[PDB]
Amino acid sequence: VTGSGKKPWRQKGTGRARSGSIKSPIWRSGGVTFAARPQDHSQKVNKKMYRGALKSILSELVRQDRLIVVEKFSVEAPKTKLLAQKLKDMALEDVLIITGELDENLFLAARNLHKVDVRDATGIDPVSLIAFDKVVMTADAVKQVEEMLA
Amino acid sequence: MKTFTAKPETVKRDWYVVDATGKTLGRLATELARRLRGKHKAEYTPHVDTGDYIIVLNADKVAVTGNKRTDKVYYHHTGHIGGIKQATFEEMIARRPERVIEIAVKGMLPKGPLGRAMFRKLKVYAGNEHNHAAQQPQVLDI
Amino acid sequence: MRLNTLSPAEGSKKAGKRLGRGIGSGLGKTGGRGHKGQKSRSGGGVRR
Amino acid sequence: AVQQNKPTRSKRGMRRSHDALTAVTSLSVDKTSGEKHLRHHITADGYYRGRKVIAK
Amino acid sequence: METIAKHRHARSSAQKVRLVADLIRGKKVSQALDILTYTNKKAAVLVKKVLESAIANAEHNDGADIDDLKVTKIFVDEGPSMKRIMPRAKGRADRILKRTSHITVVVSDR
RNA sequence: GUAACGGGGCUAAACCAUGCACCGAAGCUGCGGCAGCGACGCUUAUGCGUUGUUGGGUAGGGGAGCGUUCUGUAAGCCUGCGAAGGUGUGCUGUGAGGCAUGCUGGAGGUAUCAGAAGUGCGAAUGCUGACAUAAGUAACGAUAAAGCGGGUGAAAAGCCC
RNA sequence: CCCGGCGAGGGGAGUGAAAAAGAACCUGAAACCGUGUACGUACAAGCAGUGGGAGCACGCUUAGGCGUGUGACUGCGUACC
Fold this sequence. Notes:
The structure is cut from a larger assembly and holds chains A, B, C, D and E. By secondary structure, chain A is an alpha/beta fold. Chain A has a single domain, classed as Ribosomal protein L4/L1 (Ribosomal Protein L4, Chain: A, 3-Layer(aba) Sandwich), CATH 3.40.1370.10. Chain A has helices at 47-63, 80-90, 104-111, 126-131, 139-149, and strands at residues 67-70, 95-99, 116-120, 134-138. In chain A, helix 2 crosses helix 3 (104-111). The longest helix of chain A is centred in the middle third of the chain and has 17 residues, at 47-63. By secondary structure, chain B is α/β, with parallel strands linked by helices. Chain B has one domain. Chain B is 30% helix and 18% strand. Chain B contains 5 helices and 6 strands, in the order βαβαββαααββ. The longest helix of chain B is centred in the N-terminal third of the chain and has 13 residues, at 25-37. Chain D is low in regular secondary structure. The longest helix of chain D is centred in the N-terminal third of the chain and has 7 residues, at 9-15. Chain D is built from 1 helix and 2 strands, in the order αββ. The structure holds 2 RNA strands. Chain D: InterPro entries: Ribosomal_bL32 (IPR002677), Ribosomal_bL32_bact (IPR044957), Ribosomal_zn-bd (IPR011332). Chain D: It comes from Escherichia coli DEC2D. Chain D: Residues 1-37 are annotated as: Disordered.
């Protein structure tokens, strides 16, 4: 705290409580006893524990019928209208789409759709799988996930 | 239900006359205090004056056992530095006999505003005559 | 399986002591340090 | 020299029970001028007991 | 109908003014004016002006009459206090409060 | 200042012996309720049929919770048909508390389950601001001194003549 | 427009969804200071409460002896850290 280290008033003689610094935490306009510092909140996750969690999450999705598997998923042109129409045909609103190779056309079409996300097989994360109501994975995507999880 | 409590506006108080001639001072005072407080009534309530009006006659002829007639001393302080004054039982009887019974009963009554009110129902007379015939007091052989 | 339906295993998330926060907590007014002495002071205690 | 305890607002009011002002019981009326005035005092217009004392 | 007149931030402590206010509470306006006229207090001058203002308000804004008006309500509330410094002996400084008051007078034909 | 029964008073209302009653505690019992720890019906994804027993508490140890701000759940839900906050009332739990609603307020609030703490104040001759108290009391700063007429003014002991 | 000293400060009028948003201006808590109303209080002694409790006032609501405010009198009772 900006300020001098001078003692505000002498130790004895005055009828005031002893003070030693104008920056004392007890005082207004200076303090914070345990002022925070920038810190890293990251936690370690064992490789096996992370893989085990993904396997459990995927197993739950198939159990709850939240995992849809299709031979392929693509759009003719990079237009949000085409992707939105396609999702309506399949009756999907909040969907996470996983593909073997993230097509540029599909990626652009889904960018403006708030409830639609497109990822590659290697981009899946535990939170995304749980967060989205439905998960759509292509046949190729299932293959890569299988090898990655082993 | 709630226990019965006497109401001061509906409590019935009777008038009695007691002859103090030859009666032991203390043993007469206890009965007077008991009746002044109303302890003899089934409707007795600690916070209500349910007692009876009592007239005491011949207060100057109250009796005391032993040598108390000349040995009992009544002390009181006037509030000044000397203050302390005393009077024997004989001196009190000669000077103001009614105070002998009044002092005895007052000590036996409860202390506080209520006890002071109960004391007001006691009428002590030195002689054998009282001017409360209008109240039709009943003879009490106490 | 939703972000608001996951719970930790029982007995794996103990709360943690909070000293000097009232009589009810059982750790107020010297928070387990006892009374006057070197050990009760801030930074007090003897070396290894 | 100084108090050991803070006196109460009740005590403050009790002391001030004698601070109330007293209004004049009544005002005299000049017999001729007819205006009100303090008894034994001249009126605002210079009259007193209907004699028209100096009013300049 | 009751008419209100107020003098806010009057330069006088509420305690001093309340002494005069108690004199005329509940009195007829004609009687109240006489009382204030012959009260030798500064607050009397202040209160009289407020009372006269209330009387004028009743006429102009309500069409009332003096003969029926009376001081139904009157009170003084503490206003903001001005802080001042008073030098004392040996270099000590003292705080002076220049207290103000809000004077309210209500006149009704009741 | 009685002042060596607490008092009144007591010749028993004192003392000794004997006897029978009664008063007397948060002790014991009765009735209702809560909780901890044990064993029993392998009962039960366990509450009990029950069953005994325990529950004063500082330093201190152990166990279980309330509420506050913030992140996800939440582009959800509540909200100008009135949010937060403020102030009442009613109801409710063993407690920290919770729920509903009148008035004020005039735009934000946030379930649930998790996550993180600048997470709870009456005290430290604590810190800042506000406001009391003494009190309408002390004081109004050299005891060189003022009086009157007129003027001005809403108002003159203090200004002008 | 009106009172006021061609004041200060107010009362109307008008603007505005709102002026109890009027510039001493969003919300407007507490200490503290007032006005009004109900009840208590001038023969009574002390941590000011608690248990009991009359009276009064007020609200009831299908007399229903209930709620709310006050608290004469009375048992017990020497704050907190």
